[PDB]
Structure 1
C-alpha cells in the first residue's frame, strides 16, 4: 500500500541576491559602475493624533488635552541626492534545477512515485511556459515595489555571465511591458529559453539584473523596513528602521523573490485582478484574503494528493501551478 510521507522538504530554486541601491544622473547609464550609494539618515517628526479614536466619546476636553501632546518621534529616511534623477538597483540570481527531488523524506515509495510523476510532466512539456512567465516578470521592473509608481521611464539591463566576463546581453523598457498580461517577443523568448535550460539542469545560469528609474531630483526611495524593539523609549528610531548593507540602503532578498514569482493567473475566483504570487492557499496579505480556499478542491495539497496517489492528474494549468509551487520550495509535512 502507499501513503503520503510525513516529513517532506524541498530546497528552493531561483535564489536572488540582495538588491543594493546606487544613484546618479540619466544618460550616464553606460558608465554606472562608480555611482555613489544612497545613504539612510535621521529625521525628527512631531505630529498629531490623526487616528480614528473611540467614538461616542462626547468629551472634547480630553481631545484638546491630547492635541497639546506633540508626540515627537525619530524617523529613518533615505532620499535621492540633489544632482541625480536616476535610481540604480542591482542584484544577481542563479538558477539551479533538479527541482523534482526533495531534501528530506520518510517513505521511499512515495518519493519514487513523486519523481516519476515529475518525470512524466517534464517529458510531456518542459519548463518553457514557466520560464516564459518568469522572464516576463523579470522584464517589467516588478521587483521595484513602490519605487515603480510615478516613474517616467524604466530601463533594465540583463547580463548572462558565463565566465568572469559577460556573454550575452538584453536591454528592455519596463513600461512597454505590462503588469497584467503575458505577450511574446523574440528577446523574451531567448531569455525564457535560457531560464528553461537552467531549470532542466542542462547548464548552470548566473544572471545580473540592473535597473534604472528616472524619478527625478531629491525624491524619496523605499528600501525594506526593519523590526523595531519596543524595549526602548520614544527615541532611537522609535518609528521605523530601514534595512541596510554596510553604508547602503537595500531591499531584502525575499522581497525580490516574492516579486519574481507573481505568476498565478489560474486562481478561480476572478481574472481581472492580475497575477498572484504562487503559494499553497494562494493568498495576498495586502487584501487579507485567501484564494484557492481548500474547501474548493484547488489548493496545492489536495491537488498534489489526488495527482500522486489516485493518479487523477488535473488540468495543465493546475499542473503548472503545482510545479511552480515545487520550484518555490518549502516545508510540506504535518
Structure 2
C-alpha cells in the first residue's frame, strides 16, 4: 500500500462575500435598505472607506452553506487508499461526532472574528444568525460578540443548538443554509477596513466588501493543540500551521505534529494518534486542498 498520487478535496463551509453597509444603532430591526459603504478616493491616490455623516453602525451580511461528505476525495488514483481513507474517516465519525469541531466553528460564528479590524475598539457588536430552509426564517439566533471570548471556548444553550445544527450539516443528515449579520459600533463617520486588492479596496456593484476566503480563514481559526503557547490563543487550521503576519511557523515536520505525517501514520500504517491531533486532521480534510505527491 502507498499514497495516492493525486488527492483533491472540495471545501466545506462555503461562505459568500460580505456586503458591508452602514446605519444608525437601535434601528437594526429594519436593516434591509441601509446604504452601502462606497469606496472613494483622496490623497498620489489612495482608496478610503468611511461612514455616512448620520451613521455609526456597520452591517456585514453573508451566507454560509454547510455541505457534508467530509471524507471522500474528488480525485483519487488508488482504489485501496480511497476506501482505506473512507473507512478511517468513518471510524472517526462513528467513535465521536463532529460536535467538537462543529462546536468550535459555531463559536467562531458566535463571536465576530470575520470582522477583522472593524472589531478592535467597538462599543457593541451583535452577531445575528438565521436558519434558512425556504425563503423564511426557521430559527433565529442572537448573540453578543464582546461577551463571548476570542482566546477561550465556552458553553451556552443557543451556541450548543447552533453547533448541533452545524454537526448535522457536516455529516450529511440535512441541508443547512445560514445567513449571518454582524452589527457594530465605531462612530459618527469613522473609517472601516475592507480587504485590499492588488491601493485598491475590494468592491462589488457599488459596495465595499470582504473576500470570501478571508471569512473562511476567520472560520477555520480553531486549533488550540499546537502545544507551544496559549498566549496566542488559536490559529488557522492549515498544514505546516503557520502565520504570515507573525512570520514564524509552528507545527513543523521537525516534530511529528504535521498534517502529512499524522495522515500517513493514521491512514497507511494504522498508527492512531491522540484525539486532538485527529481533530486537527479532520479539520484539514474539511478545509480541503491539493494533497498527494
Distance apart, 1:103 and its partner CA:
0.4
* Preserved contact between residue 268 and residue 292 of structure 1 (Cα < 8 Å): no
Distance apart, 1:163 and its partner CA:
1.1
- Structure-2 separation of matches of 1:87 and 1:3: 52
Query: Secondary structure, in 3 states, of the residue corresponding to 1:167?
Result: strand
1:205-249 superposed Cα distances (whole Å, 9 cap, x missing partner): 0000001001111100001100xxxxxxxxxxxxx0000011000
Distance apart, 1:200 and its partner CA:
0.7
Query: Secondary structure, in 3 states, of the residue corresponding to 1:256?
Result: helix
1:152-203 superposed Cα distances (whole Å, 9 cap, x missing partner): 0101111001111110000000000000101000000000000000001000
Query: Secondary structure, in 3 states, of the residue corresponding to 2:64?
Result: strand
1:232-277 superposed Cα distances (whole Å, 9 cap, x missing partner): xxxxxxxx00000110000000000000110010012222210010
- Structure-2 separation of matches of 1:123 and 1:101: 16
Question: Which segments of 5 or more consecutive residues in structure 2 lack a partner in the other structure?
Answer: none
Query: Secondary structure, in 3 states, of the residue corresponding to 2:71?
Result: coil
TM-score scaled by length of structure 2: 0.98
Distance apart, 1:333 and its partner CA:
2.2
Query: Secondary structure, in 3 states, of the residue corresponding to 2:217?
Result: helix
Distance apart, 1:295 and its partner CA:
1.0
- Structure-2 separation of matches of 1:75 and 1:119: 52
* Preserved contact between residue 3 and residue 292 of structure 2 (Cα < 8 Å): no
- Structure-2 separation of matches of 1:150 and 1:124: 42
Of the two, which has the highest radius of gyration?
Answer: 1
- Structure-1 separation of matches of 2:267 and 2:59: 46
- Structure-2 separation of matches of 1:26 and 1:261: 30
- Structure-2 separation of matches of 1:11 and 1:163: 25
Question: Which segments of 5 or more consecutive residues in structure 1 lack a partner in the other structure?
Answer: 43-72, 227-239
CA RMSD of aligned residues (A): 0.6
* Preserved contact between residue 267 and residue 292 of structure 1 (Cα < 8 Å): yes
Query: Secondary structure, in 3 states, of the residue corresponding to 2:201?
Result: coil
1:127-138 matches, cutoff 5 A: 127-138=98-109
Q: Are 1:101 and 2:100 an aligned pair?
A: no
- Structure-1 separation of matches of 2:27 and 2:55: 10
- Which residue is equivalent to 2:17? 18
Aligned length: 290
